[PDB]
Amino acid sequence: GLLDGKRILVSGIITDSSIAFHIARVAQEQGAQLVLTGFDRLRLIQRITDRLPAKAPLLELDVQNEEHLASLAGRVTEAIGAGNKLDGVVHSIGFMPQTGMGINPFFDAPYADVSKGIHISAYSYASMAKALLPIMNPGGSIVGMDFDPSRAMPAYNWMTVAKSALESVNRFVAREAGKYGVRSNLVAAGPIRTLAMSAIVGGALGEEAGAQIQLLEEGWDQRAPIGWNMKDATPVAKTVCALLSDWLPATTGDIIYADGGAHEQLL
Amino acid sequence: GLLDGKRILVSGIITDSSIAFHIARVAQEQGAQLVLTGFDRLRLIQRITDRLPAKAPLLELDVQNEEHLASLAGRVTEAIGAGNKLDGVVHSIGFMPQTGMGINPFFDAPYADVSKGIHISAYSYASMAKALLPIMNPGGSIVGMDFDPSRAMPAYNWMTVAKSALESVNRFVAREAGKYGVRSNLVAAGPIRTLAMSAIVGGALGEEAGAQIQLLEEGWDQRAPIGWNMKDATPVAKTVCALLSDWLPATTGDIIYADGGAHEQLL
Amino acid sequence: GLLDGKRILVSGIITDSSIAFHIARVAQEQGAQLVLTGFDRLRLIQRITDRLPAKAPLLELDVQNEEHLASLAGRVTEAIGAGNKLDGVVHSIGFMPQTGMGINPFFDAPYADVSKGIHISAYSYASMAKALLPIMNPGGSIVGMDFDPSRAMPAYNWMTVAKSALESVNRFVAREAGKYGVRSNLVAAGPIRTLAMSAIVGGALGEEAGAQIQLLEEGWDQRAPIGWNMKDATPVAKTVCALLSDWLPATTGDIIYADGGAHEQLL
Amino acid sequence: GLLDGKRILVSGIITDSSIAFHIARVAQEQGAQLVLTGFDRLRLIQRITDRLPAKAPLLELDVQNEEHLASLAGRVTEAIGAGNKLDGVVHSIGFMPQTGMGINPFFDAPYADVSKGIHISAYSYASMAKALLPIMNPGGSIVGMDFDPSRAMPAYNWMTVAKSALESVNRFVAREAGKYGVRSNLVAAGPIRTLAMSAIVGGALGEEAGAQIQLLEEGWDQRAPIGWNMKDATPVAKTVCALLSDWLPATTGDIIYADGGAHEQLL
Ligand SMILES: NC(=O)c1ccc[n+]([C@@H]2O[C@H](COP(=O)([O-])OP(=O)(O)OC[C@H]3O[C@@H](n4cnc5c(N)ncnc54)[C@H](O)[C@@H]3O)[C@@H](O)[C@H]2O)c1
Ligand SMILES: NC(=O)c1ccc[n+]([C@@H]2O[C@H](COP(=O)([O-])OP(=O)(O)OC[C@H]3O[C@@H](n4cnc5c(N)ncnc54)[C@H](O)[C@@H]3O)[C@@H](O)[C@H]2O)c1
Ligand SMILES: NC(=O)c1ccc[n+]([C@@H]2O[C@H](COP(=O)([O-])OP(=O)(O)OC[C@H]3O[C@@H](n4cnc5c(N)ncnc54)[C@H](O)[C@@H]3O)[C@@H](O)[C@H]2O)c1
Ligand SMILES: NC(=O)c1ccc[n+]([C@@H]2O[C@H](COP(=O)([O-])OP(=O)(O)OC[C@H]3O[C@@H](n4cnc5c(N)ncnc54)[C@H](O)[C@@H]3O)[C@@H](O)[C@H]2O)c1
């Protein structure tokens, strides 16, 4: 197994279409022992994760909660056993209030809303590294989920801005993590049909935004030399696992693109 | 004159070493009629700007103040005269609480501090465009000040993250501005010895941070094929003026580097 | 005038739709005194340039000819007068054999053809700098024409590869030029309907390539926040002039995008 | 094993310090069945590769030889057995005549020399893909070796230009390879003390170039958050193997950096 013997914390599961659900599944398939964290709806998350190939402890983590973050390392240690540390950490957490996305004008997002989204989507990558690095082994790996923000695009609006901050945060986390012998990287994924993504295509954030995201997805598959299947999160789960393994040991502060090769092609 | 007949709003003057002071001076030298905005210490700013080659109205603008932003367009119109619009806008505003910079550990910056810095340094670029676009002429130009955040670096910490967000904001502002026939760009400048920069070199944010910033500056000049003079803001003021002129009419959502060519050289 | 008193060498005029024709026209409009170089069809080029607002000496320059390059500085000095030097140099030269473009398979371009195209399109930027730097004044500016090659695209094939090499050459030329107090930069332009471009849209390199280039152009204008007019080379001529002026004095080894802002927008 | 059952062609072994020697070793350690290609000194290469953990057929391949390339697919099929195809291809080939590197002035490299280096170092990536794609399985992977050319640097000169072309070639190869269900990527490695690299540090290309390369290496390790060991090629061999595996299945036309994280850090 690719991750035999590794202890890995996976955040961000909320449904069975969550990217983190598939990261967790593939990780277990490859021999990893997991600890999960979940936000708010813990009964739902437990029920969802019962479907994973192996059992895994579920800890509550609201990334905006200082107390949750302060106690996290202790709770993880309790879950995996004193004297054991984590080898891997997956950050698969993102959020932006509706005012910062969709057909709501870019200029009309109130800073308080933008700031909440940047807190959850970018700052929390640093918050989690701070909480967990003291309990990680040398050779460890921290991975977060990215959506390539190097160009602006319709609809994504302030979430794209938050991803830009996240990529910058990642390079700083790499500096800190390096002192523990730990890597920090992002996986920039193509669009994936999660429940939220489907809602948006279905017009949940405005018809115009729905149409733009649908077009975005179609152009993505078209220019990807090996195609892109927005209904299949497995290729991104495998990529996250590659970064958690020992097979990219000299890569840190970096971004790995699991996007079908769309970002390197113009037409 | 390069800017003959143009009406230009310049924010960000606080002392005579402010980059915006030099932007304003060169702009006036090239025929621009200016409106200035200042934060907090208005008597100081008025006294400082009395030294500019021509007179210019000074309006108060706290970029975190909704009321200031809501009234800004009216106050500018009053200052330049009904029926006249702006041709140019300069955003030269940046701030990050001390906890987000220097030898204070990256992980120890509290989100409230980071969020204030991102508000002032990144979000406010959008806030100003929102306030001013309704009073800009086609062919107009909005320019903000950037410090290349594509790589992480010691000491700059969360301010670098804020610049990353700003570059992302700029690309979105370009989309909105385009509808008014207005461009939006950033000038990424080399390090400039402002009062704050001198304080930091002098150890104001920790000796270790001071030493790193001093080394950063020295390597900058070394690899710049035409050198870099951190004591001379004129080359960046000229670059900002180039973007306010009619001579880069097909450039928008972009970053122009006024850095001596340091960023394109490795050693 | 923007270029009052400047002596500028402009290569690359072959017809009145040549980008270099418009660079030359705008430069003269702004007070520059020009020396032109032309390849092969000198009688045609003289006849074409008679239409420029002012007269300008025409020197022959085949960029693949060592003798032409060896004698170039002397011939320019003769044309502008002993004791005078150039302030500006415009490289607007590009070529790729048909086998390296269009519907001819990428893999089927013979190296001899690719190498000719890279010689003319990339290496010659260095060849010209070598020839002319000894006769340039401090504060001088060398500018070449680029087409953004950071992503692959249909039809452009090996010409895109040649532009990639050119951008790399430019950064090295900046290093050498810096020793003379001279800048070196590229202008990455949007697609322009030159005679060759029209021929290709018209199917000259295959119907499939024609269709792709036409689609490329249409998407370009669509995502450009201020639009893109492929029939109007003036916005790029103005940008080249901005780089030849004294208004971007701290930019070197760099790329300025005159593309309507298309490259910074995804959809 | 990571590459159990995979048939992989590895070019570029010339000594036991060759990066390709270590790629081949790790690949065999992970269950790959190899076919090797070698240039010129075949007796030397056979003797060197006898030290690999398993036996592997050695085919001659001069990448500038049309006949070698024309017959390559047949010779590989003969070596691995009719009805079997390759799952992987490693391009670890690079060369630049001395005139294009070191203290020899950048401007003094004759085009014939530059063109030879670009032929071997960049064009041949396409030559090999053309030869081998007809004998690759869906899900296959082509990998080439890169040295990050995004910024200019002392000494590397025209080899850096050749790497720039190579990165561009890679994106085009991805387009062609995609039609076979095959990926194409580069690994951008940190500096590695091969025999040639040691010779250069030792002054083989000029004392000034030796000093610059030594400084380059030292700064590399310094800014790498997890360090860089130029004497250890294993971390890059592992990275190449990661790309040959099934664990980055949605990455193509891309560059993976195995550089200790040096390129994402400024100081
Ligand atoms: N779906 C896509 O097209 C796509 C593409 C690229 C990257 N991503 C990124 O992948 C990551 C996972 O998103 P997803 O698409 O799987 O959506 P998702 O809704 O399934 O998962 C997002 C998770 O973030 C959690 N979260 C929100 N606020 C939180 C907080 N305060 N504390 C802790 N957790 C919180 C939610 O509970 C949820 O579990 C996100 O960072 C997203 O931006 C998604
Ligand atoms: N100095 C450098 O090395 C350097 C390099 C690149 C970019 N920059 C950028 O240039 C810009 C100008 O900075 P500077 O170096 O001239 O420093 P400065 O201190 O002279 O100017 C910063 C200005 O921002 C203003 N400001 C802070 N909070 C504000 C708020 N709430 N509302 C309105 N204004 C507010 C201050 O009053 C001050 O006038 C900044 O964006 C800075 O990041 C500086
Ligand atoms: N047209 C576009 O869409 C576009 C877009 C971006 C960049 N560019 C670049 O702009 C530059 C000018 O091209 P253009 O579009 O004006 O086409 P053009 O045909 O009008 O000009 C190209 C010039 O290169 C010259 N040339 C070819 N081989 C030469 C050699 N051996 N020695 C000297 N000169 C030689 C030709 O004589 C011609 O004058 C080229 O580098 C081109 O790649 C063009
Ligand atoms: N050593 C480094 O610091 C470093 C760093 C990054 C990337 N790289 C790249 O890694 C690759 C391998 O280089 P290396 O460092 O292992 O050096 P090396 O000398 O060990 O290997 C280079 C190989 O290229 C082969 N070659 C040269 N001309 C050829 C031709 N005509 N046909 C077929 N093969 C030919 C040589 O025989 C040799 O086997 C190169 O592409 C190099 O640029 C090296």
Tab-separated table of N, CA, C and O and ligand atoms in Angstrom, chain C residues 11-15 17-20 38-40 45 61-64 91-95 116 120-121 145-148 156 159 163 166 187-197, ligand 3:
chain	number	residue	atom	x	y	z
C	11	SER	N	13.328	47.481	-36.991
C	11	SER	CA	13.352	46.370	-37.942
C	11	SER	C	11.934	45.861	-38.196
C	11	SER	O	11.000	46.260	-37.507
C	12	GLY	N	11.779	44.979	-39.179
C	12	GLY	CA	10.535	44.237	-39.329
C	12	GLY	C	9.401	44.813	-40.171
C	12	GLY	O	8.302	44.249	-40.184
C	13	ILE	N	9.629	45.916	-40.876
C	13	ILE	CA	8.598	46.382	-41.816
C	13	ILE	C	8.684	45.589	-43.114
C	13	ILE	O	9.764	45.445	-43.693
C	14	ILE	N	7.557	45.028	-43.541
C	14	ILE	CA	7.489	44.359	-44.845
C	14	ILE	C	6.245	44.785	-45.634
C	14	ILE	O	6.255	44.770	-46.864
C	15	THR	N	5.185	45.175	-44.928
C	15	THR	CA	4.020	45.776	-45.571
C	15	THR	C	3.449	46.836	-44.652
C	15	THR	O	3.939	47.039	-43.541
C	17	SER	N	0.676	46.692	-43.174
C	17	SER	CA	-0.016	46.081	-42.039
C	17	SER	C	0.966	45.460	-41.027
C	17	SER	O	0.546	44.971	-39.983
C	18	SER	N	2.263	45.482	-41.336
C	18	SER	CA	3.288	45.050	-40.379
C	18	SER	C	3.121	45.811	-39.071
C	18	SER	O	2.896	47.018	-39.081
C	19	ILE	N	3.230	45.111	-37.941
C	19	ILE	CA	3.208	45.778	-36.645
C	19	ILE	C	4.309	46.864	-36.581
C	19	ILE	O	4.098	47.956	-36.036
C	20	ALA	N	5.473	46.564	-37.150
C	20	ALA	CA	6.593	47.514	-37.150
C	20	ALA	C	6.295	48.779	-37.951
C	20	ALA	O	6.850	49.835	-37.659
C	38	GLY	N	15.446	46.321	-43.218
C	38	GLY	CA	14.502	45.518	-43.969
C	38	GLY	C	15.151	44.262	-44.502
C	38	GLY	O	16.364	44.218	-44.726
C	39	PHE	N	14.337	43.232	-44.709
C	39	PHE	CA	14.845	41.945	-45.168
C	39	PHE	C	14.411	41.649	-46.606
C	39	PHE	O	13.219	41.630	-46.904
C	40	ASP	N	15.395	41.432	-47.477
C	40	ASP	CA	15.179	40.866	-48.807
C	40	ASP	C	14.566	41.833	-49.834
C	40	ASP	O	15.246	42.270	-50.765
C	45	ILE	N	10.027	47.537	-49.509
C	45	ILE	CA	10.041	48.173	-48.195
C	45	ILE	C	10.232	49.686	-48.291
C	45	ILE	O	9.546	50.451	-47.613
C	61	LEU	N	19.042	44.176	-43.641
C	61	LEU	CA	19.452	43.280	-42.570
C	61	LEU	C	18.737	41.941	-42.658
C	61	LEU	O	17.540	41.834	-42.358
C	62	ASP	N	19.485	40.942	-43.119
C	62	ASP	CA	19.093	39.547	-43.027
C	62	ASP	C	19.715	39.036	-41.742
C	62	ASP	O	20.943	38.924	-41.613
C	63	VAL	N	18.850	38.728	-40.794
C	63	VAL	CA	19.262	38.400	-39.444
C	63	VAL	C	20.030	37.072	-39.378
C	63	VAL	O	20.692	36.769	-38.388
C	64	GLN	N	19.965	36.298	-40.455
C	64	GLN	CA	20.730	35.060	-40.555
C	64	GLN	C	22.079	35.285	-41.242
C	64	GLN	O	22.867	34.356	-41.410
C	91	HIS	N	12.962	45.211	-32.279
C	91	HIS	CA	13.053	43.935	-32.953
C	91	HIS	C	11.612	43.488	-33.225
C	91	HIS	O	10.872	43.194	-32.293
C	92	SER	N	11.205	43.474	-34.492
C	92	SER	CA	9.850	43.068	-34.861
C	92	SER	C	9.953	42.042	-35.987
C	92	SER	O	9.394	42.201	-37.075
C	93	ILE	N	10.681	40.976	-35.690
C	93	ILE	CA	11.068	39.985	-36.670
C	93	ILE	C	10.634	38.615	-36.193
C	93	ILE	O	10.878	38.242	-35.053
C	94	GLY	N	9.979	37.865	-37.065
C	94	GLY	CA	9.558	36.524	-36.712
C	94	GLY	C	9.323	35.721	-37.965
C	94	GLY	O	8.907	36.260	-38.986
C	95	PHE	N	9.610	34.432	-37.896
C	95	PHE	CA	9.361	33.552	-39.023
C	95	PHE	C	9.381	32.109	-38.554
C	95	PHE	O	10.133	31.757	-37.655
C	116	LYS	N	15.633	27.001	-38.211
C	116	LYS	CA	15.578	28.251	-38.962
C	116	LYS	C	14.648	29.246	-38.271
C	116	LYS	O	14.978	30.421	-38.128
C	120	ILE	N	15.675	32.932	-36.559
C	120	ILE	CA	15.108	34.210	-36.937
C	120	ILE	C	14.257	34.823	-35.832
C	120	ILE	O	14.285	36.035	-35.628
C	121	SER	N	13.511	33.984	-35.119
C	121	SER	CA	12.502	34.463	-34.171
C	121	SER	C	13.016	34.681	-32.738
C	121	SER	O	12.449	35.491	-31.990
C	145	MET	N	9.025	41.885	-30.084
C	145	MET	CA	7.623	41.501	-30.137
C	145	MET	C	7.413	40.037	-29.760
C	145	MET	O	8.079	39.142	-30.289
C	146	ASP	N	6.453	39.810	-28.868
C	146	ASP	CA	6.211	38.497	-28.283
C	146	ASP	C	4.746	38.109	-28.511
C	146	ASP	O	3.887	38.976	-28.681
C	147	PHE	N	4.465	36.811	-28.537
C	147	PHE	CA	3.077	36.315	-28.483
C	147	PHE	C	3.038	35.289	-27.357
C	147	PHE	O	3.719	34.260	-27.430
C	148	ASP	N	2.295	35.608	-26.298
C	148	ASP	CA	2.328	34.849	-25.044
C	148	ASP	C	2.325	33.328	-25.235
C	148	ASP	O	1.308	32.751	-25.604
C	156	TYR	N	-0.260	27.364	-33.778
C	156	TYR	CA	0.972	28.138	-33.607
C	156	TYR	C	2.190	27.229	-33.441
C	156	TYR	O	3.298	27.595	-33.834
C	159	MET	N	6.138	27.883	-33.631
C	159	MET	CA	6.293	29.320	-33.405
C	159	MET	C	6.082	29.673	-31.925
C	159	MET	O	6.729	30.568	-31.390
C	163	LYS	N	8.713	31.501	-29.457
C	163	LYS	CA	8.435	32.605	-28.531
C	163	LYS	C	8.869	32.286	-27.100
C	163	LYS	O	9.325	33.175	-26.371
C	166	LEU	N	12.450	32.968	-27.040
C	166	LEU	CA	12.650	34.411	-27.109
C	166	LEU	C	12.515	35.095	-25.748
C	166	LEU	O	13.315	35.960	-25.409
C	187	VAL	N	7.137	43.153	-25.773
C	187	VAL	CA	5.706	43.423	-25.753
C	187	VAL	C	4.967	42.185	-26.280
C	187	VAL	O	5.104	41.801	-27.453
C	188	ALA	N	4.200	41.553	-25.400
C	188	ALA	CA	3.355	40.428	-25.801
C	188	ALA	C	2.024	40.974	-26.300
C	188	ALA	O	1.209	41.441	-25.512
C	189	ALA	N	1.822	40.935	-27.617
C	189	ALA	CA	0.629	41.503	-28.228
C	189	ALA	C	-0.480	40.466	-28.439
C	189	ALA	O	-0.213	39.266	-28.556
C	190	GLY	N	-1.722	40.946	-28.486
C	190	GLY	CA	-2.848	40.124	-28.906
C	190	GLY	C	-2.699	39.858	-30.390
C	190	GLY	O	-1.814	40.431	-31.033
C	191	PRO	N	-3.554	38.989	-30.950
C	191	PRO	CA	-3.425	38.675	-32.376
C	191	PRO	C	-3.771	39.879	-33.261
C	191	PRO	O	-4.733	40.607	-33.009
C	192	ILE	N	-2.975	40.085	-34.298
C	192	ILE	CA	-3.143	41.245	-35.154
C	192	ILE	C	-3.279	40.757	-36.587
C	192	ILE	O	-2.500	39.909	-37.033
C	193	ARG	N	-4.256	41.301	-37.308
C	193	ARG	CA	-4.504	40.890	-38.680
C	193	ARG	C	-3.494	41.452	-39.662
C	193	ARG	O	-3.808	42.359	-40.435
C	194	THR	N	-2.291	40.899	-39.634
C	194	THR	CA	-1.288	41.197	-40.640
C	194	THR	C	-1.658	40.416	-41.879
C	194	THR	O	-2.582	39.596	-41.863
C	195	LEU	N	-0.914	40.630	-42.954
C	195	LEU	CA	-1.175	39.886	-44.182
C	195	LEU	C	-1.065	38.376	-43.933
C	195	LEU	O	-1.918	37.605	-44.366
C	196	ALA	N	-0.038	37.955	-43.198
C	196	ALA	CA	0.144	36.533	-42.914
C	196	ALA	C	-0.996	35.959	-42.090
C	196	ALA	O	-1.504	34.875	-42.386
C	197	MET	N	-1.407	36.691	-41.063
C	197	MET	CA	-2.518	36.267	-40.225
C	197	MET	C	-3.816	36.101	-41.032
C	197	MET	O	-4.562	35.142	-40.843
E	3	LIG	N1	0.496	39.300	-35.984
E	3	LIG	C1	0.298	38.836	-34.750
E	3	LIG	O1	-0.935	38.298	-34.354
E	3	LIG	C2	1.401	38.890	-33.729
E	3	LIG	C3	1.078	38.817	-32.370
E	3	LIG	C4	2.088	38.911	-31.411
E	3	LIG	C5	3.401	39.070	-31.827
E	3	LIG	N2	3.702	39.128	-33.155
E	3	LIG	C6	5.117	39.312	-33.532
E	3	LIG	O2	5.354	40.597	-34.076
E	3	LIG	C7	6.522	40.555	-34.892
E	3	LIG	C8	6.202	41.205	-36.244
E	3	LIG	O3	5.325	40.346	-36.951
E	3	LIG	P1	4.091	40.881	-37.829
E	3	LIG	O4	2.852	40.278	-37.269
E	3	LIG	O5	4.195	42.360	-37.912
E	3	LIG	O6	4.404	40.100	-39.216
E	3	LIG	P2	5.167	40.717	-40.504
E	3	LIG	O7	5.206	39.667	-41.540
E	3	LIG	O8	4.504	41.963	-40.942
E	3	LIG	O9	6.657	41.052	-39.980
E	3	LIG	C9	7.652	40.073	-39.747
E	3	LIG	C10	8.974	40.649	-40.244
E	3	LIG	O10	10.043	39.749	-39.999
E	3	LIG	C11	10.908	39.829	-41.102
E	3	LIG	N3	11.874	38.730	-41.270
E	3	LIG	C12	11.649	37.407	-41.543
E	3	LIG	N4	12.850	36.791	-41.650
E	3	LIG	C13	13.831	37.706	-41.473
E	3	LIG	C14	15.219	37.637	-41.481
E	3	LIG	N5	15.871	36.549	-41.888
E	3	LIG	N6	15.940	38.785	-41.259
E	3	LIG	C15	15.312	39.989	-41.033
E	3	LIG	N7	13.949	40.051	-41.024
E	3	LIG	C16	13.225	38.927	-41.237
E	3	LIG	C17	9.989	39.972	-42.313
E	3	LIG	O11	10.648	40.607	-43.379
E	3	LIG	C18	8.930	40.883	-41.757
E	3	LIG	O12	9.347	42.188	-42.056
E	3	LIG	C19	6.879	39.087	-35.039
E	3	LIG	O13	7.902	38.776	-34.116
E	3	LIG	C20	5.600	38.380	-34.621
E	3	LIG	O14	5.836	37.082	-34.135
E	3	LIG	C21	2.721	39.054	-34.118
